[PDB]
Design a protein around this ligand. Structure first.
Ligand SMILES: [K+]
Ligand SMILES: [K+]
Ligand SMILES: [K+]
Ligand SMILES: [K+]
Ligand SMILES: [K+]
Ligand SMILES: [K+]
Ligand SMILES: [K+]
Ligand SMILES: [Mg+2]
Ligand SMILES: [Mg+2]
Ligand SMILES: [Mg+2]
Ligand SMILES: [Mg+2]
Ligand SMILES: [Mg+2]
Ligand SMILES: [Mg+2]
Ligand SMILES: [Mg+2]
Ligand SMILES: [Mg+2]
Ligand SMILES: [Mg+2]
Ligand SMILES: [Mg+2]
Ligand SMILES: [Mg+2]
Ligand SMILES: [Mg+2]
Ligand SMILES: [Mg+2]
Ligand SMILES: [Mg+2]
Ligand SMILES: [Mg+2]
Ligand SMILES: [Mg+2]
Ligand SMILES: [Mg+2]
Ligand SMILES: [Mg+2]
Ligand SMILES: [Mg+2]
Ligand SMILES: [Mg+2]
Lengths: 247, 132, 129, 343, 205, 211
RNA sequence: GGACCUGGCGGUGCUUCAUAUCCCUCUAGAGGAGCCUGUUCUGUAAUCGAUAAACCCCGAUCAACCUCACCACCUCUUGCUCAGCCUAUAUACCGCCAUCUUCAGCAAACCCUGAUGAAGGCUACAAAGUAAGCGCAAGUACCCACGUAAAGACGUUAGGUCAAGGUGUAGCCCAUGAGGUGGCAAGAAAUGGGCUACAUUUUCUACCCCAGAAAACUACGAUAGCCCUUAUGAAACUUAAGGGUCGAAGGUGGAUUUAGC
């Protein structure tokens, strides 16, 4: 761990004029910032954040209170609002740390071609314990095959068929693509959910970028993380407790 | 409050070793196992026999090297070889450490009918991880 | 706090030390714990204002006496000079008064340090020959 | 069973019963207490009942340049070894039994008056070997606590002094009686008073003061008079270096009020030089053993006044009826002027 | 929840997305560029963009579901909607050209209007005063009014007074009764309102 | 001073009730004994200020005619909002007029309150309507609109004992038929000194190939 | 006896509160019926422990013999053991835990205040607190940074366990130890928890969701009773499984009450 060096010499005289504050590094910075604000008066966001207290406590190599951190930030913001020059901009940037934002843009699967030259895309989806892999063809008549079976024969429940409709209906492409998908594990609903996600991800290769973002905002490209919760010992279920015995 | 294998906070004067300082929930997270063998793997047999043998070897070595062990034993089994790795102190004369190694290796080899080796690492004093 | 910046600069320029911030409990009476067993404490504490922001005596006045440190202090008409070794009755509020005090102490301190170097240098040159 | 046996640490932790509801609140008292004993202390590796001699473990490995062989002590030779180890065990116990006794204080069961030694050396190579520490009061204070009920702490009052005028006192507080001793004696050495002594044996003048409800009246006395004072005052006076003084304590007899009241009165005594400087006159001491010889004890450093001090025919000073009643032979007490040990 | 607070609920509405940019306000433009940076929850399997989607019927279906048996709950609802439509087609063909104009044959319009005729405007709350319980009238929020209309309809059909009659025939008969401001469920509304009027004096509490 | 406490050491401190002070405050800090007093008394001052504005015609002609009466005025400790309560009128029609004018007046009143430099920093005032049972008139608004439709087991428990169960119990039986002393804590005896006066006696070079 | 401090308590004030949470609100239940199981009481020659929250399908992830520690009878005495004891004491203890904890505090070592009294030590435009360490936190496990696990100090209830084992003190040693044979563990009842029901969102069959029948004294409803068979075992009116016979109470349950975001 980084060690603060001795703060006085052989004669016992501290090196820094703010030694006896106990926070010479923190108060030396406040003194430098306060002095700059004075000189300005005499003269006259998305990609960046303020450093956290644990990062300021390392630049200074000192221990800092929570209010000490706030006071320093309140003083820098008061310095940005002023007509700060180039010298007053390199300084503030020392305490600004770049904030990286992940892009929520959906990744588009590559468009492949089969032996006959028909363009198609392939993706995968997971719902609970069900795992689906769907092949969506660029051109088709609206046929959906699930493990080699007609979707309405594989999914006799009307709600499971509605889930297959949801991705295509949302982008107005019913009757325009052929799909051959395979699904294993889980129940009937989990399999329909896994196929819905698999078809939606593969379908993104044949729609415009704006349409892919509308599907994302419609919940059609997000893997559902809701899975069965474990039972805990000493209780009836994942959450239910045993009856609190009558007293 | 949980008690199992937990050295409790005191006044800051009690030296504990790295092993003693970690409660059971840290096993496989911060601390490893003191014995390694195949008996507890899936589809493996003779876990009961390896367990009793290990309990004995720990008691045997504690009383055969009284006041000399500076930490728990590490027991290693490869094939039929049994390796005992012990961290010991530097108080006993080296002649007595060679006697007890020769004596213990032979006695344990005839007891469990396997080649047994004892590996001693000496430390000037018990290694202290923290003062609880 | 009107003069915190001025006083910190005066200290740095003369080669001395300033404490214009919130004075923490035991900085003087518990210095070895806070700084270390070999910390050297001040030989002289100069108060440009002897009262804190709640109009009570600065804690360092009492703590300086406890540690047998002599204190110089500007004492206005509402201040208590009993424990200040060298009190100076004077206005501590007007910027002109406070600025004057800083010039005098800064100049007195700077002259005394230069005098020490002059004497030492002469004492060495004369010593060799 | 071999596998049901435990280690010595486990057995002593159980047998001693130092952790438990008995030992949490001292709910159990210990006139008879199990004492931990180290059973590996006098044990030699290699030594057993059968008396075998193992070369390299309990006997030398080589004898006469040749390796020794396995041997066994004779039945007679082994009885001696067993007997010798039993005697060594009583000798070890007898050595522990022989512990140097410490002197008692004001009474056999009292802490007051007992020496604690010099304060500990400070962090910066500071030492206080010249200072002695004496206990004045050890109290058990009981604090009622929100969750833990009545808890027991210790408040200790100790005084320190070097016997040459420098002395002080400090209170100590801790859960343990020995931590309170450390805090009190170490803190007191940083709060030392200097006490002026006349001829390095007594006070400069009679001192009568009240601190809260505790009254202390002290009288300057000649050499050989000794310390005829409250036992606590005697203890403090030995630390200051006062050899001859009379003191009478009246009102509340509170050790703390008495201690800090005594230091307040001894620190505000005017010396003869201060009186001479204050009045610019000579201070002349008249001793009956020296007859009419005038002995100048102090002379003013500044100019010497030429106008005599006014001689008020009758001084308007307040007198103590106790002092006057004694000088007139009207003080009758069976307890006054009793023969006592040298103090 | 397995969704971190950062996850926002999905907006399933085709129209909301095809709306041209020019029609958008500066506030609605900000909301749209913001969602492109937000995390979106996966759309639940219940609701889709289908044009036949009705959230009220989906809610009534869930309130009829026993032990997670949505297939059976959904079956009962679609059987009730078919039973309502057939009862109206039979009343329609048996009516005169003048009466035919007033006969509704859409089961969704009947279902919605039947529930709206059962929503209680004001409800009572049991309050304790001097060791004695007295109810107090209070206005009902929109969420609570719609819930009570459903719960009263489902509760009435589950009453044991009905002997061996299947749910699609019980519910279909009750919906058409309430659609005409008649029935037990409408009486429960009327009586709740009536009990509130009696307790107007206690409304100060 | 009075029985009302005024011993505070920082009695000369400048009272600073602003929104910025709340953010720059130690989280551990808790309100002192006389810290509530300033809040209790500052809230009362706001009540005084608002009451005068309502009854003086100069502030506003519409406000004066309304003759609004303030039931309660309590500022918040956060310093972000202020709670003011006015008494409702019987006529719901009249209630709407008062609320409408008060709602628009509040904005101007806030600036009028800023005229008092002592209370220049006044958080936005929340003119809550209460004290007049606003929810009772609201209920009547619904009551008239609402459609009412066409207009027209053991006495043992009362006794307090289960006489039946006990009667069976006895019948079933008939079927088969046919202090210490506590020591004062201060006086508990200790032997630490006796162990002390008895005595406390708990009681280099290195070479390669040594001999 | 006076004054004060702490704690406890107040049919004690004020303000803000609890998120499956104190009340209402939401869903499914318990409280009624039968059965399964625990405890209590009663009974028996016939264990023991838990037993308000924090006991009551609890020690037991388990009692036909064995297990077993119990009762009756008979037998052995340096005894499987360099003996033995499930004898007393959990108010001597280790060990392992419950509880608040669905907490966030505990605190060594110093320093300062109150006259150096018991005590107290915070104000950020800051007024005497600094603090190692422990806990929380962080981290790690599981499918994420979410959630759930795990973790959770000090202290509280002399909380539970001497019958897991070990063990201090006290007691037995031809018996309070050891072995054998047989036997006990029932219900006049009360009560806790659970199971199955009372049915039509149901019952039976096919199927695993586009069906056909049933549907009130031959319906729904026992996993109960009775009889038989089989499995395990040396041993089964006794334990379990299956078949036959039988077709009961029960018609959705007062005060009250449990769990779930
Ligand atoms: K109290
Ligand atoms: K029930
Ligand atoms: K215990
Ligand atoms: K035990
Ligand atoms: K025992
Ligand atoms: K026996
Ligand atoms: K039950
Ligand atoms: Mg469940
Ligand atoms: Mg636990
Ligand atoms: Mg001034
Ligand atoms: Mg004695
Ligand atoms: Mg029942
Ligand atoms: Mg029992
Ligand atoms: Mg019992
Ligand atoms: Mg018990
Ligand atoms: Mg209890
Ligand atoms: Mg048995
Ligand atoms: Mg026995
Ligand atoms: Mg206990
Ligand atoms: Mg996490
Ligand atoms: Mg847990
Ligand atoms: Mg944690
Ligand atoms: Mg107990
Ligand atoms: Mg038997
Ligand atoms: Mg049967
Ligand atoms: Mg058989
Ligand atoms: Mg039948």
């Amino acid at each position: 761990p980084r060690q603060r060096a001795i703060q006085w010499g052989e004669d016992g005289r501290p090196f820094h004029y703010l030694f006896y504050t106990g926070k010479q590094s923190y108060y030396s910075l406040m003194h430098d910032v306060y002095g700059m604000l004075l000189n300005l008066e005499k003269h006259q966001v998305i990609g960046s954040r303020w450093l956290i207290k644990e990062e300021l406590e390392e630049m200074l190599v000192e221990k800092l209170s929570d209010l000490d951190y706030m006071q320093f930030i309140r003083l820098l913001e008061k310095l940005l609002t002023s007509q700060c020059g180039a010298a007053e901009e390199e300084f503030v940037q020392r305490f600004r740390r770049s904030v990286t934002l992940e892009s929520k843009k959906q990744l588009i699967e590559p468009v492949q071609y089969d032996e006959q030259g028909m363009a198609f895309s392939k993706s995968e989806g997971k719902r609970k314990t069900a795992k689906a892999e769907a092949i969506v063809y660029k051109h088709g008549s609206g046929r959906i095959k699930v493990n080699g079976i007609d979707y309405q024969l594989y999914f006799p429940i009307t709600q499971d068929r509605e889930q297959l409709m949801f991705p295509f209906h949302f982008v107005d492409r019913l009757g325009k693509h052929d799909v051959t998908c395979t699904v294993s594990g889980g129940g009937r609903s989990a399999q329909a959910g896994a196929i819905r996600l698999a078809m939606a991800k593969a379908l993104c290769s044949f729609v415009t970028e704006d349409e892919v973002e509308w599907m994302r905002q419609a919940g059609l490209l997000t893997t559902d993380p809701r899975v069965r919760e474990r039972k805990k010992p000493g209780q009836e279920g994942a959450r239910r407790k045993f009856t609190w015995k009558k007293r | 409050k949980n008690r199992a294998a937990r050295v409790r906070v005191s006044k800051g004067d009690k030296p504990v070793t790295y092993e003693e300082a970690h409660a059971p929930h840290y096993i496989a997270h911060r601390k490893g196992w003191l014995s390694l063998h195949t008996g507890n793997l899936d589809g493996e047999d003779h876990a009961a026999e390896r367990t009793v043998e290990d309990v004995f070897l720990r008691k045997f070595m504690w009383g055969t090297f009284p006041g000399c062990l500076a930490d728990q034993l590490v027991l290693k089994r490869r094939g039929n070889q049994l390796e005992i790795c012990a961290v010991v102190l530097r108080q006993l004369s080296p002649h007595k450490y060679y006697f007890l190694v020769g004596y213990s290796e032979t006695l344990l080899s005839y007891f469990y009918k396997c080649p047994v080796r004892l590996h001693l690492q000496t430390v000037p004093s018990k290694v202290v991880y923290k003062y609880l | 706090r009107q003069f915190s910046y001025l006083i910190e600069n005066m200290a740095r320029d003369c080669g001395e030390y300033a404490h214009t911030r919130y004075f923490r409990g035991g900085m003087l009476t518990n210095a070895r714990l806070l700084f270390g067993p070999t910390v050297r404490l001040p030989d002289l504490i100069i108060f440009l204002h002897t009262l804190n922001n709640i109009f009570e005596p600065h804690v360092a006045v009492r703590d300086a006496a406890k540690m047998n440190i002599p204190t110089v202090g500007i004492v206005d008409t509402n201040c208590n000079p009993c424990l200040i070794t060298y009190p100076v009755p004077g206005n501590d509020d007007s910027p002109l008064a406070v600025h004057l005090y800083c010039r005098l102490f800064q100049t007195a301190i700077t002259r005394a340090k230069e005098k020490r170097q002059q004497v030492e240098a002469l004492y060495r040159l004369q010593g060799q020959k | 069973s071999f596998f049901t046996k435990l280690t010595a640490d486990e057995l002593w932790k159980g047998a001693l019963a130092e952790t438990g509801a008995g030992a949490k609140k001292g709910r159990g008292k210990r006139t008879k207490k199990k004492k931990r004993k180290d059973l590996n202390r006098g044990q030699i590796i290699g030594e057993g009942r059968y008396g075998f001699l193992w070369p390299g473990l309990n006997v030398p490995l080589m004898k006469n340049g040749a390796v020794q062989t396995i041997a066994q002590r004779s039945k007679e030779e082994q009885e001696k070894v067993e007997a010798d180890m039993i005697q060594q065990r009583e000798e070890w116990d007898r050595k522990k039994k022989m512990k140097v006794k410490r002197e008692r204080g004001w009474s056999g069961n009292s802490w007051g008056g007992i020496s604690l030694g010099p304060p500990d050396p400070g962090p910066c190579g500071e030492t206080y070997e010249d200072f002695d520490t004496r206990i004045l009061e050890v109290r058990n204070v009981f604090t009622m606590t929100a969750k833990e009920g009545r808890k027991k702490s210790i408040r200790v009052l100790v005084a320190v002094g070097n016997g040459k005028g420098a002395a002080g006192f400090s209170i100590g507080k801790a859960t343990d009686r020995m931590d309170a001793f450390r805090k009190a004696k170490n803190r007191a050495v940083h709060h030392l008073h200097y006490i002026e002594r006349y001829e390095d044996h007594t006070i400069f003048h009679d001192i009568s003061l009240r601190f809260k409800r505790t009254h202390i009246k002290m009288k300057k006395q000649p050499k050989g008079y000794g310390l005829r004072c409250h036992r606590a005052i005697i203890t403090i006076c030995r630390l200051i270096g006062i050899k001859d003084m009379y003191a009478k304590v009246s009102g509340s007899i509170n050790m703390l009020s008495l201690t800090q009241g005594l230091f307040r009165g001894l620190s505000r005594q005017e010396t003869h030089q201060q009186l001479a400087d204050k009045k610019g006159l000579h201070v002349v001491e008249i001793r009956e053993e020296c007859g009419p010889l005038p002995i100048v004890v102090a002379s003013p450093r500044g100019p010497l006044r030429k106008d005599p001090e006014p001689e008020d025919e009758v001084p308007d000073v307040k007198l103590d009826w106790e002092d006057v009643k004694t000088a007139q032979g009207m003080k009758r007490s069976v307890w006054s002027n009793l023969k006592r040990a040298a103090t | 929840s397995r969704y971190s607070p950062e996850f926002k609920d999905p907006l399933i509405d085709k129209e909301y997305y095809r709306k041209p940019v020019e029609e958008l306000t500066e506030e609605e433009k900000y909301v749209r560029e913001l969602k492109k940076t937000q995390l979106i929850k996966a759309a639940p399997a219940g609701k889709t963009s289908s044009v036949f989607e009705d959230p009220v019927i989906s809610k009534f279906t869930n309130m009829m579901m026993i032990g997670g048996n949505k297939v059976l709950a959904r079956s009962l609802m679609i059987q009730t909607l078919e039973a309502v439509k057939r009862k109206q087609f039979e009343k329609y063909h048996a009516a005169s050209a003048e009466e035919q104009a007033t006969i509704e044959r859409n089961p969704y319009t009947i279902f919605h209007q039947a529930l709206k005729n059962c929503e209680p405007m004001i409800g009572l709350v049991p309050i304790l005063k001097g060791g004695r319980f007295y109810q107090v009238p209070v206005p009902l929020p929109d969420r609570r009014r719609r819930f009570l209309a459903m719960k009263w309809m489902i509760t009435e059909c589950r009453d044991k007074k009905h002997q061996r009659t299947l749910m699609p025939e019980k519910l279909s008969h009750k919906l058409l009764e309430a659609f005409h401001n008649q029935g037990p469920v409408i009486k429960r509304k009327h009586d709740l309102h009536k009990m509130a009027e009696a307790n107007r004096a206690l409304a100060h509490y | 001073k009075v029985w009302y406490e005024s011993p505070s050491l920082g009695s000369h401190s400048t009272y600073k009730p602003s929104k910025l002070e709340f953010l720059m405050r130690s989280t551990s800090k808790k309100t002192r004994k006389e810290d509530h007093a300033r809040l209790r008394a500052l809230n009362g001052l706001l009540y005084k200020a608002l009451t005068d504005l309502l009854c003086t015609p100069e502030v506003s002609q519409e406000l004066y005619d309304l003759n609004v009466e303030l039931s309660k005025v309590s500022l918040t400790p956060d310093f972000s909002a202020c709670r003011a309560y006015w008494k409702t009128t019987l006529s719901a029609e009249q209630n709407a007029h008062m609320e409408a004018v008060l709602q628009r007046s509040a904005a101007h009143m806030r600036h009028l309150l800023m005229s008092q430099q002592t209370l220049r920093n006044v958080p936005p005032i929340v003119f809550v309507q209460d004290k007049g049972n606003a929810a009772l008139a609201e209920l009547d608004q619904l009551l008239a609109v609402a459609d009412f439709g066409p207009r027209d087991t053991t006495s043992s428990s009362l006794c307090g004992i289960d006489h039946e169960a006990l009667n069976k119990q006895i019948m079933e039986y008939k079927r088969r038929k046919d202090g210490r002393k506590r020591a004062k804590p201060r006086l508990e005896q200790d032997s630490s000194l006796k162990s002390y006066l008895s005595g406390e006696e708990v009681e280099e070079y290195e070479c390669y190939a040594p001999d």
